[PDB]
Design a protein around this ligand. Structure first.
Ligand SMILES: CCCCCCCCCCCCCCCCCC(=O)OC[C@H](COP(=O)([O-])OCC[N+](C)(C)C)OC(=O)CCCCCCCCCCCCCCCCC
Ligand SMILES: CCCCCCCCCCCCCCCCCC(=O)OC[C@H](COP(=O)(O)OCCN)OC(=O)CCCCCCCCCCCCCCCCC
Ligand SMILES: CCCCCCCCCCCCCCCCCC(=O)OC[C@H](COP(=O)(O)OCCN)OC(=O)CCCCCCCCCCCCCCCCC
Ligand SMILES: CS(=O)(=O)C1CCN(c2cccc(Cn3cc(-c4nc(-c5ccc(OC(F)(F)F)cc5)no4)ccc3=O)c2)CC1
Lengths: 345, 96, 318, 98, 80, 172, 51, 115, 105, 70, 114
């Protein structure tokens, strides 16, 4: 890949969601989504292996179907009430099919069966992008029309995402699928509160992003893709075990870490609207989410799996990674709960 | 040569359009008067019909405003025959 | 009356296709130091009727490997479109006045390729498939430059209508300002018809007949007459766009006469070219249209976008 | 108008049904996607002409642009799939089960 | 560089012409004194009716009649 | 007349159905060409010609490319048609019958805002400017150059990026 | 966790590269003759083609 | 209505020709006649197998170029606009970006066929 | 809206052609222009919660201009009654309704 | 010699001239000794429908002059 | 809900022109300078009131002024105007550039006698 191609493609990836955010017309939101999903593919298939090709196919087909559905919704809201952007006087069928398609894109349950695979088949720096930067524009759409979304549908989707993320990442050995299911669960959280308060789903998104990005960075440090591989960190990069453990316990939602703040301030805002049952179930299954992060902490830091006769070489050699941003984000993702009032509003 | 010829063509277009301008008032008067005639005929006949059906107001509008809403082809040419109707729809798309 | 006009536009076109086959044979003969048909009738004016009658008297073929539906539809469509492209033509008055006549032409022509495609696919023979894929390549090659050439010309006409070109050329041909575009359009029409040097869809020296190899008398005659009709059609297009017959509203007959003279000249030129040159390789056609005609075509499109502006010569909308 | 729009919506729904209910071949699904694009383009153009809103005609042409770009990348992915497995079948890309 | 342009004009003159025409198309509008007239003409065309205004009695610059010598004249287009 | 646009929409529906039944992409591209022709016809019947001719040309080129591709990647020894599989033919006929049923039962039980067999042809061209000179559809699509400049750069960049992207994808 | 469904499951490769069954070439064979005009009359010239 | 008339007349002419071509002549059908033609000998395989395409990239590119043509076609109307500078600039940008994409493809050897 | 960049820089990339009441080519007018204008002007400065109750009359007039369900119902009922009459012989369309009219002008 | 070709060329020339002259003469014969009115924009069609109506018989080419204003 | 009022068939009755289109196109450039006042009063009254029912007597006055114009024609210069519009009705678009020798006779006739 030459720098001209890289420039065009990455600029397009960046531009896609910007148009969606900065646009009043729905059609241009759609073309932004399309820029995103057209530019992201070559970065997936760059490695040129069967897994990459099939990941690309499963991503393209799904996103194209969802985009066509969103376009149908826009066109019906144009035929009706003769404007482009939605309004209070718009069919709930339109709104709900739009929400369903946006979920399909985001990868929420039961529209999630494609995200773990697509993330397992590609490299890690793209999984990072896929799970962090590509989940915004859909959420922008949802945040511009939150008064109109049905609460029944988003709540069913959210509890389903929570349950399925937990149960799925529970028995995964590959790390990329664990991160995929973490994304599914945290997106379920993001969505469970969107109609009541969308200033909290953005918070949960920011926190999940600053939490998963340095995890992916750690994995990319030694190109670690399994539990048994990260088990070897005590011999390769033992200076990373502390941050790894803290970020995992935060992702799980343990105090006094700022991964507990989204959970807590979402349960609160939900019970301010009398959603006792939803928040209860969500928390009880976030516990299960935490379980496999804890098993992973065991495997990596709190005990020492066997190593190999060759890692002595890796010990001999030097390393230029990670950069400054890993430490920054990993500190601002575990040790910032004391500033919660500043984070929440 | 093409410059000069296209300029003279633009001038001739100005001329044709100025003629159209001079004539549009007459056409507008005729069109308005004719639409009103058609609507009054359809009103008289809607009154003959619907004379005994319960709870029917002949000229009742489907609008809560009282300003003039220009009618549409279905209304103007609804009671009339089907050829006089298809002309209004496909008459100009199905050229002279 | 309209049906009589349909007849006066259709039957002469078919007679002209027949006598165009005749003129083709005789011109190529005299170029090849031979005569051409002179036996069947006086100087051979019955050879086309002989050929057609003989073909429609032969046993057609319903092979075992073919998709008969498409195998039969394709020639129907070929001939239909070859005859339908002649309706919006002003000579100087058309039978069907279309505002977007140019686009009708473009679409119908781009559609006539599916006759070849479906014929070659249905036949279910390798040479047929090869002819079909070669047609695919040929279209992919020429269709890009066709529309841009045509747009660049029309940006001084003011519309896609074929009857405003007559007033545009009322004083001077469109060849002088657009002879580069005229040359490229000539070669691209040469390709659109699968005509030499671009007779690749039926290249007898590589593919026995291409998409025709399994086709027999009647359907083959349909294909052949569609080809020799589209020839005259594209010549008429060249000589309505770039060459301008004399239009004096009291004298449309002179317009038809000069139109016919120029069309004959351009068709005889097609035959001349078939006789004078070897045949391309279907990759070289792509390379030509995509490396010498498309760059220049874009440059000239920009030139003719600007010219009406820094000349104040923007055309009128009716 | 209303019957036209109902039929075009039913057509979009049929093409979506096809896209969702795969068969062996992938290009058929790509074609169903293109059919959905066609339905939507037609619906939008009809709406803009019924409303006489000539400021919204630039929309369907963009629809077509982006639909064709999607089709292009789909055809490229299809090329890669065929190179890998020799065929465009969907039952062959099932190795990401782990 | 002249030798490069020369061997290109000999070998690949089609791209030379293409770039030259590109540049001339981009330049000549900046050069001509008849460029301003395009928009003036496309504005002079009355594709719509010239809706008249109410004579409030404070429109001295506005005419009471087409042939009243007031308003935009098209002489610059009648002799161009 | 009056049944014209409805017949067009029904033919479009049947084309899209036979497409969704996924026969060999050859016949699917055929159905797509036919559906684009019908869409052109109906768009012309609603007033606009430019958009119809446009979509027609576009889908013709697309189906040309698709033929070229399916003859290379999506072919089979015995390609399937609508008649080949009894099940596919049966569901096709069933879909036609179900369309008929839906129409004839909605006309009865439903209101007239969706399907009104009696009253057909009355609502195609609601309003029009009888004295008009500048109503062609190409005026709107040309607004891209003057007013809607954003859509133009957006689409052009989409195509640029598409070139680069397909190259990068097809690299071996 | 194992199941009756996940018994045949194999751990994926360490580089995401999968040893794949080598799909042999399918080269279109064609009888270029005889009766072909190019072929001067008695040549068959069976050849293989990739396109 | 007249366009419909003419086109249907042409349909009927073609179909009449085909009918009288399929029902007028004397036939004698047998397998060795109805069998495919492969230059005197028997086919070694079916013609319904993958026929590799070496210009697939050029066809993909042709799609996008067709779309750019679709975007260029409204110029005859865009030149009737008051905002002439904007139309000029946008058309120039469009054609230039098109040419730049073509040049990148050319240089990276996309217009050349896989061998 | 999510990032009101336009409203910051003071530009308009996508918002000057959203609804039908916007500037159209050559100062034409989309149908239901006035209804849309009045709806928008009523819904200005009060929010979408109030507008759903206070601009209801205007929005309904707009919805009827655009979709025209009620004109359809009315003309359908008229035609139905007329067909009933003609069936049972209680009506005869006047001349101007049967082609034979005085074609003014 | 080469002049043995002029028969076919002349035949095809006659056959290519016939269509235009026929269309023109038929348009004149059917539209009252006038060129078939062109309706490129709705204004021309409006004019033609006006003419059709004012003409006693519904035909746009029966031109009614000053003989019909008193 | 509310009724829609419509004039009566007699309230909207005039002395119609019943004159063709080529003739109007021939006489338009002179009918613009000689009836601008009434034409523009009617049309302003039209755009200002947006109701074809409030602005009707103005339309009757428009018809009357047009009839008076065409009578001033039919009295003095019937025959040149006849030649002009007969020449101008022949074209498929009723173009002026095909009848310039008759346009000049008509315009000179009117310049002289009116
Ligand atoms: C628009 C496309 C129509 C979409 C709906 C499908 C309707 C037709 C389905 C009936 C089965 C046709 C079929 O596939 O048979 C295979 C055949 C292929 O040949 P074959 O395999 O049936 O050969 C059979 C041989 N005999 C006749 C001896 C039994 O192709 C077709 O018939 C259909 C081709 C599609 C053409 C559609 C356009 C029709 C034009 C109007 C006439
Ligand atoms: C059936 C199987 C075989 C199918 C193949 C048939 C041959 C296809 C030929 C290619 C046609 C593709 C292009 C689409 C038709 C052309 C549309 C057109 O030219 O305009 C329609 C015409 C009005 O067009 P226009 O002049 O622009 O509007 C102003 C007129 N005052 O007036 C109209 O509105 C008439 C529209 C009808 C178009 C003719 C289609 C006939 C189909 C027969 C089947
Ligand atoms: C919804 C409920 C579906 C009911 C179960 C039927 C299962 C089914 O047939 O869908 C799968 C089918 C593809 O099946 P296939 O891979 O071709 O294998 C041969 C099938 N016996 O998929 C398909 O046949 C595609 C169907 C899409 C078109 C549906 C339109 C039907 C018209 C009404
Ligand atoms: C060594 S060379 O350079 O000399 C080489 C140059 C090429 N060449 C040549 C050129 C043109 C035609 C032919 C004879 N030929 C005729 C037909 C064919 N013709 C008609 C047909 C239908 C209707 C017609 O009108 C009407 F009947 F009235 F309807 C008229 C004709 N159907 O199929 C098909 C195949 C074919 O080879 C031969 C000679 C030899």
């Amino acid at each position: 890949m030459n720098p001209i191609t890289l420039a065009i493609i990455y600029f397009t990836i960046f531009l896609g969601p910007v148009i969606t955010m900065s646009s009043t017309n729905l059609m241009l939101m759609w073309v932004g989504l399309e820029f995103s999903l057209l530019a992201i593919i070559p970065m997936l298939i760059n490695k040129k292996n069967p897994r990459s090709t099939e990941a690309a196919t499963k991503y393209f087909v799904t996103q194209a179907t969802a985009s066509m559905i969103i376009l149908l919704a826009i066109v019906l809201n144009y035929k009706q009430l003769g404007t482009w952007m939605f309004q209070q006087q718009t069919n709930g069928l339109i709104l709900n099919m739009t929400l369903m398609a946006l979920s399909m894109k985001l990868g929420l349950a039961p529209f999630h069966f494609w995200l773990p695979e697509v993330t397992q088949g590609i490299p890690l720096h793209m999984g990072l992008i896929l799970l962090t930067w590509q989940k915004i524009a859909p959420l922008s759409i949802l945040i511009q029309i939150y008064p109109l979304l049905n609460s029944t549908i988003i709540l069913m989707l959210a509890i389903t995402s929570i349950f399925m993320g937990a149960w799925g990442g529970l028995n995964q050995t590959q790390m990329r699928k664990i991160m995929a299911y973490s994304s599914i669960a945290h997106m379920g959280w993001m969505l469970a509160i969107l109609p009541y308060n969308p200033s909290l789903t953005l918070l949960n998104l920011m926190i999940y992003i600053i939490l998963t990005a340095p995890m992916f960075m750690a994995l990319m440090l030694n190109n670690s893709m399994t539990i048994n591989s990260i088990s070897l960190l005590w011999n390769k990069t033992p200076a990373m075990l502390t941050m790894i453990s803290l970020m995992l316990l935060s992702l799980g939602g343990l105090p006094p870490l700022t991964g507990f703040l989204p959970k807590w301030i979402i349960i609160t805002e939900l019970m301010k609207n009398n959603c006792l049952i939803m928040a209860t179930l969500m928390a009880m299954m976030a516990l299960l989410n935490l379980f496999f992060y804890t098993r992973l902490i065991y495997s990596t830091s709190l005990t020492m799996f066997p190593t190999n006769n060759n890692s002595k070489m890796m010990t001999h050699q030097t390393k230029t990674k990670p950069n400054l941003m890993f430490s920054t984000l990993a500190i601002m993702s575990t040790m910032t709960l004391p500033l919660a009032p500043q984070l929440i509003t | 040569r093409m410059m000069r010829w296209n300029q003279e063509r633009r001038r001739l277009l100005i001329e044709d359009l100025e003629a159209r301008i001079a004539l549009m008032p007459l056409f507008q008067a005729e069109k308005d008067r004719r639409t009103l005639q058609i609507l009054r005929e359809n009103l008289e006949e809607e009154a003959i019909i619907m004379k005994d059906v319960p709870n029917w107001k002949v000229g009742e509008s489907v609008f809560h405003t009282t300003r003039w809403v220009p009618p549409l082809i279905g209304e103007m040419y609804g009671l009339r025959t089907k050829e006089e109707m298809s002309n209004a729809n496909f008459g100009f798309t199905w050229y002279t | 009356m309209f049906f009589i006009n349909i007849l006066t536009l259709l039957v002469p076109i078919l007679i002209a296709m027949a006598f165009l086959t005749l003129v083709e044979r005789k011109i190529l003969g005299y170029m090849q130091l031979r005569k051409g048909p002179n036996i069947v009738g006086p100087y051979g004016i019955l050879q086309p009727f002989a050929d057609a009658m003989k073909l429609f008297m032969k046993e057609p073929m319903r092979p075992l490997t073919t998709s008969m539906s498409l195998f039969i539809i394709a020639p129907t469509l070929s001939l239909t479109l070859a005859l339908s492209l002649w309706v919006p033509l002003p000579m100087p008055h058309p039978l069907i006045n279309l505002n977007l006549g140019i686009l009708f032409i473009l679409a119908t022509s781009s559609l006539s390729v599916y006759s070849i495609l479906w014929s070659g696919w249905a036949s279910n023979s390798k040479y047929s498939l090869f002819g079909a894929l070669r047609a695919v390549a040929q279209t992919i090659s020429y269709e890009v430059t066709m529309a841009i050439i045509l747009l660049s010309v029309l940006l001084m006409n003011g519309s896609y209508s074929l009857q405003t070109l007559i007033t545009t050329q009322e004083h001077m041909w469109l060849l002088l300002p657009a002879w580069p575009m005229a040359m490229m359009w000539f070669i691209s029409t040469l390709a659109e018809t699968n005509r030499a040097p671009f007779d690749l869809t039926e290249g007898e020296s590589e593919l026995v007949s291409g998409f025709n190899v399994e086709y027999a008398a009647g359907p083959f005659a349909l294909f052949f007459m569609a080809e020799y009709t589209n020839i005259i059609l594209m010549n008429a297009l060249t000589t309505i766009i770039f060459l301008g017959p004399l239009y004096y509203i009291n004298l449309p007959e002179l317009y038809s006469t000069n139109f016919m003279m120029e069309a004959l000249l351009l068709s005889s030129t097609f035959l001349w070219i078939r006789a004078s040159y070897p045949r391309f390789r279907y990759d070289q056609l792509m390379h030509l249209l995509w490396k010498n005609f498309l760059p220049l075509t874009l440059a000239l499109c920009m030139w003719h976008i600007s010219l009406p502006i820094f000349t104040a010569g923007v055309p009128p909308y009716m | 108008m209303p019957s036209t729009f109902f039929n075009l919506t039913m057509a979009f729904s049929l093409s979506l049904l096809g896209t969702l209910m795969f068969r062996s071949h992938l290009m058929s699904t790509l074609l169903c996607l293109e059919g959905m694009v066609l339905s939507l383009f037609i619906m939008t153009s009809v709406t803009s002409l019924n409303s006489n809103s000539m400021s919204s005609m630039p929309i369907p042409i963009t629809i077509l642009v982006f639909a064709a770009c999607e089709a292009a990348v789909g055809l490229a992915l299809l090329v890669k799939v065929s190179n890998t497995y020799g065929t465009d079948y969907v039952q062959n890309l099932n190795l990401l089960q782990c | 560089i002249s030798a490069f342009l020369k061997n290109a004009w000999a070998k690949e003159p089609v791209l030379v012409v293409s770039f030259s025409v590109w540049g001339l198309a981009i330049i000549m509008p900046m050069i001509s004194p008849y460029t301003k007239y395009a928009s003036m003409i496309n504005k002079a065309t009355p594709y719509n009716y010239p809706v008249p205004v109410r004579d409030d009695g404070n429109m001295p610059d506005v005419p009471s009649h087409p042939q009243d010598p007031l308003g935009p004249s098209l002489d610059w287009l009648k002799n161009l | 007349m009056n049944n014209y646009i409805f017949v067009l929409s029904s033919l479009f529906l049947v084309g899209c159905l036979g497409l969704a039944l996924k026969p060999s992409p050859i016949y699917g591209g055929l159905g797509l060409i036919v559906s684009g022709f019908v869409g052109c016809l109906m768009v012309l019947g609603f007033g606009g010609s430019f958009l119809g001719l446009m979509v027609f040309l576009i889908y013709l080129g697309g189906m040309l490319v698709v033929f070229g591709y399916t003859t290379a990647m999506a072919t089979e020894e015995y390609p399937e048609t609508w008649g080949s599989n009894w099940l596919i033919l049966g569901f096709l006929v069933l879909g036609v019958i179900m369309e008929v049923f839906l129409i004839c039962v909605l006309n009865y039980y439903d209101e007239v805002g969706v399907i009104n067999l009696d009253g057909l042809g009355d609502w195609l061209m609601y309003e029009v400017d009888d004295v008009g000179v500048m109503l062609e559809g190409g005026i709107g699509v040309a607004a891209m150059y003057s007013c809607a400049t954003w859509m133009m750069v957006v689409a052009g960049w989409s195509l640029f990026a598409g070139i680069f992207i397909i190259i990068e994808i097809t690299r071996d | 966790y194992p199941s009756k469904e996940t018994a045949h499951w194999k751990p994926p490769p360490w580089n995401d590269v999968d040893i794949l069954k080598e799909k042999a070439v399918t080269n279109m064979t064609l009888n270029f003759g005889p009766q072909h005009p190019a072929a001067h009359g008695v040549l068959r010239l069976v050849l293989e083609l990739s396109g | 209505m007249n366009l419909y008339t003419v086109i249907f007349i042409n349909i009927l002419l073609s179909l009449t020709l085909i009918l009288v071509a399929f029902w007028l002549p004397q036939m004698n059908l047998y397998s060795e006649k109805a069998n495919p033609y492969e230059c005197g000998f028997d086919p070694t395989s079916s013609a319904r197998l993958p026929f590799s395409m070496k210009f697939f990239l050029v066809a993909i590119t042709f799609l996008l170029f067709d779309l750019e043509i679709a975007l260029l076609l409204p110029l005859p109307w865009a030149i009737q606009t008051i905002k002439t500078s904007t139309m000029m600039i946008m058309a120039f940008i469009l054609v230039t970006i098109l040419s730049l994409g073509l040049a990148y493809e050319w240089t990276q050897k996309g217009l050349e066929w896989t061998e | 809206p999510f990032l009101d960049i336009q409203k910051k820089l003071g530009i308009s990339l996508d918002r000057h052609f959203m609804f039908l009441s916007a500037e159209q080519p050559y100062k034409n007018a989309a149908r239901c222009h006035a209804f849309e204008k009045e709806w928008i002007e009523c819904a200005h400065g009060i929010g979408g919660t109030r507008a759903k109750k206070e601009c209801k009359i205007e929005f309904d007039d707009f919805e009827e201009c655009l979709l025209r369900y009620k004109t359809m119902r009315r003309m359908h009922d008229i035609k139905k009654q007329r067909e009933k009459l003609m069936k049972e012989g209680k009506y005869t369309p006047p001349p101007h309704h049967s082609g034979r009219e005085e074609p003014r002008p | 010699m080469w002049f043995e070709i002029l028969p076919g060329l002349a035949i095809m020339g006659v056959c290519l001239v016939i269509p235009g002259v026929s269309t023109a003469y038929i348009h004149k014969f059917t539209n009252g000794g006038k060129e078939k009115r062109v309706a490129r924009v709705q204004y021309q069609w409006y004019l033609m429908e006006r003419d059709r109506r004012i003409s006693g018989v519904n035909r746009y080419y029966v031109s009614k002059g000053l003989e019909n204003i008193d | 809900p509310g009724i829609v009022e419509l004039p009566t068939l007699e309230e909207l009755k005039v002395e119609e022109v019943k004159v063709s289109s080529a003739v109007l196109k021939a006489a338009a450039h002179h009918y613009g300078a000689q009836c601008d006042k009434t034409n523009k009063e009617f049309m302003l009254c039209r755009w200002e009131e947006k109701d074809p029912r409030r602005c009707l007597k103005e339309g009757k006055l428009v018809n009357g002024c047009a009839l008076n114009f065409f009578r001033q024609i039919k009295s003095h210069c019937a025959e040149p105007f006849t030649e002009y519009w007969t020449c101008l009705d022949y074209s498929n678009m009723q173009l002026f550039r095909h009848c310039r020798q008759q346009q000049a006779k008509f315009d000179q006739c009117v310049l002289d006698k009116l």
